[PDB]
Amino acid sequence: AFAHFVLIHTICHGAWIWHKLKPLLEALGHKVTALDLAASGVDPRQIEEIGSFDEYSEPLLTFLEALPPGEKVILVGESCGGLNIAIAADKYCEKIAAAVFHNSVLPDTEHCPSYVVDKLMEVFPDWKDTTYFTYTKDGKEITGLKLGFTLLRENLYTLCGPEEYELAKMLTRKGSLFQNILAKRPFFTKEGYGSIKKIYVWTDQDEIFLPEFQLWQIENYKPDKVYKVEGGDHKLQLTKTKEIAEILQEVADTYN
Numbered sequence: 644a645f646a647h648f649v650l651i652h653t654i655c656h657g658a659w660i661w662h663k664l665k666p667l668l669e670a671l672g673h674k675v676t677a678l679d680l681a682a683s684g685v686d687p688r689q690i691e692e693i694g695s696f697d698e699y700s701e702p703l704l705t706f707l708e709a710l711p712p713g714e715k716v717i718l719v720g721e722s723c724g725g726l727n728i729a730i731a732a733d734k735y736c737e738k739i740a741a742a743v744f745h746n747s748v749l750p751d752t753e754h755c756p757s758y759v760v761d762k763l764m765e766v767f768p769d770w771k772d773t774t775y776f777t778y779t780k781d782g783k784e785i786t787g788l789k790l791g792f793t794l795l796r797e798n799l800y801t802l803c804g805p806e807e808y809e810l811a812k813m814l815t816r817k818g819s820l821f822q823n824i825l826a827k828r829p830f831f832t833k834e835g836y837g838s839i840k841k842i843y844v845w846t847d848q849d850e851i852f853l854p855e856f857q858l859w860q861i862e863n864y865k866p867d868k869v870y871k872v873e874g875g876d877h878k879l880q881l882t883k884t885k886e887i888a889e890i891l892q893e894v895a896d897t898y899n
Contacts, residue, residue: 646717646740646895647674651703653722654818655790657684659810660721664880667888673895676716678702680727683816690787694780696756696821696828700727707735715740717894720747721880722852723820726756733835741840741898743891744866746852746877751864752837757825759860764822766856770794776817787819798851801876840898842868844890849877868897 648668650661658677665675681699682688693699710716717740720728725747732739748759772791777784790799792812800808831837843866847854861869870890875882 644896644899645672645674646891646899647676647714648891648895649703649706649716649718650675650677651718651720651724651727652678652680652683653720653724654699654820655683655788655815656721656811657686657814657816659684659814660878661880662810663884664887667884668891671888671892673891676706678706683818684814690817690819691778691780693819693821694783694785695824696726697730699819699821700730703727703731704734707731707738710735710738714738715899717741717743717891717898719743719745719891721745722747722877725749726760726825729756729831729836732839733832736835736838739839741842741867741894743842743844743894745844745887746846746849746857746879747843749841749843749860749864749866750831750836752831752833755826755830756828757822759863760820760822760825762859763852763856766853766859767851771797783824785819785821785823787817789817790815794851799877800881801848801850802874803876803878803881807878807881840868841866842870842890842894842898844870844872844879844887846872846875846877846879846883848874851877868894 657679661677679686682690728742729750771794776787845857
């Protein structure tokens with residue numbers, strides 16, 4: 644079977660992270676959309692204009708709204724992308740065949756939206772040369788960040804080629820975890836987000852979302868299906884592109 648995959652990058656990144664996976668899924672016959680989220684990739688907004696993770700998720704929500712009745716997609720989110728999937732599933736769960744988490748946060752419905760992020764900051768507290776700033780939007784002070792080049796080299800793109808790591812230094816932009824507004828956001832709902840099929844893909848060789856954190860998430864909110872990719876690094880769509888497209892073909896063959 645063929646599916647329509649909507650690939651969702653993590654904070655400080657853009658659609659460009661999917662530049663190897665998107666042609667491979669198309670060579671299997673799938674339709675693929677790789678979005679730039681607010682103030683990400685070549686989106687014209689800057690992060691200081693964004694006041695929440697929901698506003699950050701606007702391109703994905705606008706995209707799902709534009710789907711004609713009866714059209715379903717499979718969402719695929721990397722790292723913070725799982726939170727954009729949860730926001731989207733509470734507005735458009737009927738348009739989501741399945742959601743695939745790719746070395747991603749897995750929000751739940753029994754604790755607040757920041758829960759999993761707070762636990763990530765506990766397991767991985769040192770973000771090395773990452774820099775921080777603050778800006779104000781809609782009454783709230785938000786901490787922005789720009790991922791450090793050594794953190795990028797060693798923990799996110801560990802085993803990626805130098806030309807892939809180069810794209811990250813050239814293209815990663817200022818972002819925000821919006822951790823404080825997620826903590827005060829209403830919980831993801833059991834009838835929206837809780838109802839969608841959830842497939843968790845990970846590698847135990849990920850150097851930032853460590854096995855303790857990822858195994859903690861699988862245990863906290865049981866996925867419908869779990870795939871563990873051997874080897875690679877945090878950016879499995881660059882180091883294990885073929886294995887991710889094989890997993891996504893099975894998901895397209897299982898969930899519609």
